[PDB]
RNA sequence: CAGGUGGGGAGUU
């Protein structure tokens, strides 16, 4: 799957170019109006002139879903906990139409250089590349971001790290922002202890954060009761995708709104 | 992270004018947003006021990149080492040379634009003047210096070379 | 002296319809007790015209030349109201991302 | 501005003049002179239609809500007969540089509701 | 008030 950059070219133009280049591509469902799924392509997709020019960027449908769930607004301060690999940042910048301030943070310098190269290829001009810890970013680097995008990596140590990152994202999210203090948490795995337990822990830690519907037209609802573990009623608003259900890589998406 | 000196700014201004002419003032002054040039390490970056405000908090060593780079500042104060400014310079390019598909592949690979592969010219391109290479779809391709004028290129052998390539969009992935 | 007659004609035209003349009257040396009353009448007529055209998707675009003229030239309240209307129209236009063929969505927004 | 365009139009051969012409549209909102200037600008070899003409024409379309319908139709026909394939000039378009005073990132819908009945027919024909 | 940035400036080796 390749996500077409709206800031570079239109979806119809990209599809026509792919057809001319001999790549069989179709829209990725109805949820995404720009994602194109390539079935057959004689020429290399990554070596295509459009890909080199930045017309299309190879991104997963599940990865593109968190950007839609976040729904960044123009002229807004959106901070991403994990800038790598840059596909989500590019999608957020395309949605923002090169407006506002995008805080791209990557703890790994090796991935940060690749993300910066991808940003330069995509043509994003309002993105800032920084290398700092996500937990310390809300208090030591900057806070009060209008939107928060916590693409937590996806076992006990990872869950503890994810909970710490979620708490920092909630603190970095400004509840007084005009666009609203919306924080979108995404995971690369469908583990209950990684997604549902972290969401419940974050909700208990921060009463000012309330779970809200992610707005995704597809995805399994969050589990409220799993064996002896029971989750909050608002946990059902989370969207869960499975390889055997949504025909895409397993991911969990949650949306939280900060009131105070 | 350093403010650009007057000598450094003047060194790059002539290089920018070599391709955009007097159109550099359009990017220099913009009341809509204070987007200006800044110097981080040896890479000059054109960033907005908010970007500079955001990149202010970032450390000079930590901030690897920001905005769009206009090229590394070498020892001899040379520019265009990075082709990230091709999109910005495309809108303000004084001379544009359209190359057919025959030379489009060599241009992407970095080969010089041959006379036989030149499709359209601005008809007023001086020799050794900074111009912008373009494709049939009006898409920017790269940076090329033309050592010949249209008056002599109107009657030239196919094997002759017109514009020598210096940067290309293919360098992004190469 | 004839400004009140023009204001009455403008009000009648606005009712029948339901800007350049109003801007000229507002920018006139008389407008820019009787002068205050004429200015208030012109502001009311401008507000009525803005409200009538507020339903249009291009309301911020049409009012843009008037906003620039008003900014260059009660007047502050009218300018702020016009700016708020333009911002709301721009937000509605941004939300209405439907293609020109699907004019029903624009009509529904209108 | 017309004199400057005429001087530049001399065979065998101006940004401030272009900026002044673009900004003078709002105070105007003479028609023959404006049409001749637009035709001369269109007649310029490769000097226009590089995505800049659409930005310039956006203000003209916005200002076209007034004045005689014949003048508005001629202004619309100037871009209708243009060899450029751009079609977003009558809708949302690219960033509006050169002072701006407009949407950076509709008119025909409001133009249909006009005193002249032929305005709606012209808008429908353009659409 | 706290934090970030800070061969920009001032001061130490």
UniProtKB/Swiss-Prot annotation, chain A:
GO terms for cellular component: nucleolus; nucleus. Keywords: Methyltransferase, Nucleus, Phosphoprotein, Ribosome biogenesis, RNA-binding, S-adenosyl-L-methionine, Transferase. Belongs to the class I-like SAM-binding methyltransferase superfamily. RsmB/NOP family. Its main location: nucleus. It comes from the Eukaryota. This is 25S rRNA (cytosine-C(5))-methyltransferase nop2. One of its GO terms (biological process) is rRNA base methylation. It is found in: Nucleus; Nucleus, Nucleolus. It comes from Schizosaccharomyces pombe (strain 972 / ATCC 24843) (Fission yeast). S-adenosyl-L-methionine binds at residues 82-88, 106, 133, 151. One of its GO terms (molecular function) is RNA binding. The chain holds residues 266 to 545 of 608 of the full protein. S-adenosyl-L-methionine-dependent methyltransferase that specifically methylates the C(5) position of a cytosine in 25S rRNA. Required for 60S ribosomal subunit synthesis and processing. The active site is at 188 (nucleophile).
UniProtKB/Swiss-Prot annotation, chain B:
It is found in: Cytoplasm; Nucleus, Nucleolus. InterPro entries: NIP7_N, Nip7_N_euk, PUA, PUA-like_sf, PUA_sf, Ribosomal_synth_fac_NIP7, UPF0113_PUA. GO terms for cellular component: cytosol; nucleolus; nucleus; preribosome; preribosome, large subunit precursor. Pfam families: pre-PUA_NIP7, UPF0113. One of its GO terms (biological process) is assembly of large subunit precursor of preribosome. The keyword Nucleus applies. GO terms for molecular function: RNA binding. Its main location: cytoplasm. The keyword Cytoplasm applies. Residues 94-170 form the PUA domain. Keywords: Cytoplasm, Nucleus, Ribosome biogenesis, RNA-binding. Belongs to the NIP7 family. Interacts with pre-ribosome complex. PANTHER family: CYCLIN-DEPENDENT KINASES REGULATORY SUBUNIT/60S RIBOSOME SUBUNIT BIOGENESIS PROTEIN NIP7 (PTHR23415). Required for proper 27S pre-rRNA processing and 60S ribosome subunit assembly. This is 60S ribosome subunit biogenesis protein nip7.
UniProtKB/Swiss-Prot annotation, chain C:
The chain holds residues 482 to 637 of 707 of the full protein. It is found in: Nucleus, Nucleolus. Belongs to the NOC2 family. It comes from Schizosaccharomyces pombe (strain 972 / ATCC 24843). This is Uncharacterized NOC2 family protein C1142.04.
Swiss-Prot record, chain D:
It is found in: Nucleus, Nucleolus. Transmembrane segments: none annotated. It comes from the Eukaryota. Belongs to the CBF/MAK21 family. May be required for synthesis of 60S ribosomal subunits and the transport of pre-ribosomes from the nucleoplasm to the cytoplasm. This is Nucleolar complex-associated protein 3. It comes from Schizosaccharomyces pombe (strain 972 / ATCC 24843). The chain holds residues 562 to 742 of 747 of the full protein.
């Amino acid at each position: 799957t390749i996500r077409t950059n709206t800031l570079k070219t239109q979806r119809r133009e990209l599809a026509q170019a792919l057809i001319n280049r001999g790549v069989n591509l179709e829209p990725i469902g109805k949820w995404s109006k720009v994602g194109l799924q390539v079935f057959e392509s004689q020429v290399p997709i990554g070596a295509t002139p459009e890909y080199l020019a930045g017309h299309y960027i190879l991104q997963a449908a599940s990865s593109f879903l968190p950007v839609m769930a976040l729904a960044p607004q123009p002229n807004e301060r959106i901070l991403d906990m994990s800038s790598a690999p840059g596909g989500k940042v590019t999608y957020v910048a395309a949605l923002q139409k090169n407006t506002g301030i995008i805080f791209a943070n990557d703890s790994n310098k090796a991935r940060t250089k690749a993300l910066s190269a991808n940003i330069h290829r995509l043509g994003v001009r309002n993105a800032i590349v920084c290398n700092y810890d996500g937990r310390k970013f809300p208090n030591e680097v900057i806070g009060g971001f209008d939107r928060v995008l916590l693409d937590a990596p996806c076992f006990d140590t990872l869950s503890h790290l994810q909970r710490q990152l979620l708490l920092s994202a909630i603190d970095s999210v400004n509840a007084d922002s005009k666009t609203g203090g919306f924080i979108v948490y995404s995971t690369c795995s469908i583990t209950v202890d990684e997604d549902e337990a972290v969401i419940q822990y974050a909700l208990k830690k921060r009463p000012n954060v309330k779970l809200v519907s992610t707005g995704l037209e597809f995805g399994r609802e969050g589990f409220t009761r799993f064996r002896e573990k029971r989750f909050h009623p608002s946990l059902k608003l989370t969207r869960r995708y499975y390889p055997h259900v949504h025909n895409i890589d397993g991911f969990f998406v949650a949306k939280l709104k900060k009131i105070s | 992270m350093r403010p650009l000196t007057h000598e450094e700014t003047k060194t790059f201004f002539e290089k920018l004018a070599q391709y955009i002419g007097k159109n550099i003032t359009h990017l220099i002054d913009r009341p809509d947003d204070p987007h200006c040039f800044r110097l981080q390490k040896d890479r000059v970056y054109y960033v907005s006021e908010r970007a500079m405000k955001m990149a202010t908090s970032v450390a000079r060593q930590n901030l690897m990149s920001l905005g769009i780079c206009f090229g590394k500042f070498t020892k001899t104060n040379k520019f265009r080492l990075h082709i990230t400014a091709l999109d910005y310079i495309a809108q303000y390019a004084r001379y544009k040379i359209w190359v057919k598909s025959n030379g489009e592949m060599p241009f992407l690979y970095g080969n010089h634009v041959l006379k036989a592969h030149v499709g359209r010219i601005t008809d007023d391109t001086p020799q050794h003047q900074g111009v912008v290479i373009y494709s049939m779809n009006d898409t920017p391709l790269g940076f090329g210096v033309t050592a010949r004028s249209t008056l002599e290129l109107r009657r030239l052998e196919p094997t002759a070379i017109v514009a020598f390539h210096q940067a290309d969009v293919g360098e992004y992935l190469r | 002296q004839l400004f009140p007659m023009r204001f009455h004609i403008i009000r009648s035209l606005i009712y029948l319809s339901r800007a350049p003349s109003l801007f000229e009257v507002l920018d006139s040396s008389y407008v820019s007790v009787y002068q205050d009353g004429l200015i208030d009448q012109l502001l009311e007529l401008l507000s009525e015209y803005y409200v009538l055209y507020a339903t249009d998707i291009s309301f911020p675009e049409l009012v843009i030349p008037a906003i620039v003229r008003s900014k260059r030239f009660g007047l502050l309240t009218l300018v702020n109201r016009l700016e708020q209307q333009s911002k709301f129209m721009t937000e509605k236009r941004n939300q209405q991302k439907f293609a020109p063929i699907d004019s029903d969505s624009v009509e529904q927004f209108a | 501005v017309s004199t400057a365009f005429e001087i530049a139009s001399a065979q065998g051969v101006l940004g401030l003049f272009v900026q002044r012409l673009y900004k003078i549209i709002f105070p105007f909102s003479e028609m023959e002179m404006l049409l001749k200037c637009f035709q001369v600008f269109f007649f310029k070899s490769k000097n226009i239609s590089s995505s800049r003409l659409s930005s310039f024409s956006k203000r003209l379309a916005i200002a076209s809500m007034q004045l005689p319908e014949h003048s508005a139709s001629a202004d619309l026909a100037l871009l209708k007969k243009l060899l450029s394939r751009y079609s977003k000039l009558s809708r949302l378009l690219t960033s509006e540089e050169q002072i701006g005073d407009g949407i950076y990132n509709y008119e025909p819908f409001l133009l249909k509701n006009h005193y002249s009945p032929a305005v709606s027919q012209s808008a429908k024909e353009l659409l």
